[PDB]
Design a binder for this molecule. Structure first.
Ligand SMILES: *[C@@H]1O[C@H](CO)[C@@H](O[C@@H]2O[C@H](CO)[C@@H](O[C@@H]3O[C@H](CO[C@H]4O[C@H](CO)[C@@H](O)[C@H](O)[C@@H]4O)[C@@H](O)[C@H](O[C@H]4O[C@H](CO)[C@@H](O)[C@H](O)[C@@H]4O)[C@@H]3O)[C@H](O)[C@H]2NC(C)=O)[C@H](O)[C@H]1NC(C)=O
Ligand SMILES: *[C@@H]1O[C@H](CO)[C@@H](O[C@@H]2O[C@H](CO)[C@@H](O[C@@H]3O[C@H](CO[C@H]4O[C@H](CO)[C@@H](O)[C@H](O)[C@@H]4O)[C@@H](O)[C@H](O[C@H]4O[C@H](CO)[C@@H](O)[C@H](O)[C@@H]4O)[C@@H]3O)[C@H](O)[C@H]2NC(C)=O)[C@H](O)[C@H]1NC(C)=O
Ligand SMILES: *[C@@H]1O[C@H](CO)[C@@H](O)[C@H](O)[C@H]1NC(C)=O
Lengths: 66, 50
């Protein structure tokens, strides 16, 4: 997973590709796993920005409540 | 997928790991598949305990 450029001009778009082929494509929820431990190098995002980075992710309570 | 110990003291916790590395981690839905046939060796659970 990489980010094309940076937020310098609001371009925090995330794409996933192989290590030999350059095929920028939207990530999928099934392609990740959840870990209980975190490191300094990982970006500390929030729930509101979760749909922005990954629109495929869905929150059950956010939809059911409203 | 393995279960650490048994229900002898209510420890029916399930973890998944590789066959060489010991990394007990919570399983994910996408890692499993659905089959129409069942065997004797499979535990007969229910929806509440899912
Ligand atoms: C997203 O947000 C998280 C949360 O802030 C960032 O993760 C880091 O989280 C830690 C803990 O809150 C932040 O604090 C740093 O802790 C490091 C390790 O903890 C030590 O803390 C004390 C003091 O160092 C030690 O005595 C103790 O034994 C622990 O080992 C420290 O290495 C850092 O110390 C730095 O600053 C102090 C001054 O406060 C200096 O004296 C040190 O030499 C050193 O320079 C610090 O205390 C840490 O700041 C968070 N990281 C960052 C980068 O801010 C994620 O990193 C963040 N993600 C992104 C992408 O920003
Ligand atoms: C979770 O729950 C399920 C459902 O009970 C368990 O799966 C097994 O399901 C079968 C069917 O309901 C249970 O019954 C056993 O059937 C076996 C095969 O079926 C044969 O049934 C008759 C009688 O044997 C045969 O004539 C016919 O041709 C079928 O081939 C049998 O092998 C078993 O027979 C045992 O008991 C009889 C006495 O009733 C003896 O005569 C036999 O020699 C033999 O000892 C039985 O009839 C079966 O009990 C269920 N298994 C278990 C372990 O209970 C899952 O196994 C269960 N999961 C867990 C983890 O418990
Ligand atoms: C998240 O779900 C909990 C129920 O476990 C609910 O109380 C809470 O309000 C929900 N939050 C949002 C933002 O949907």
């Amino acid at each position: 997973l990489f980010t094309h450029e940076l937020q310098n001009h609001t371009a925090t778009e995330y794409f996933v590709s192989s290590r030999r082929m350059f095929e920028p494509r939207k990530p999928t929820v099934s392609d990740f796993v959840q870990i209980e431990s975190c490191v300094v190098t990982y970006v500390n995002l929030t729930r509101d920005q979760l749909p922005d980075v990954i629109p495929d992710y869905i929150d059950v309570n956010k939809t059911r409540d409203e």
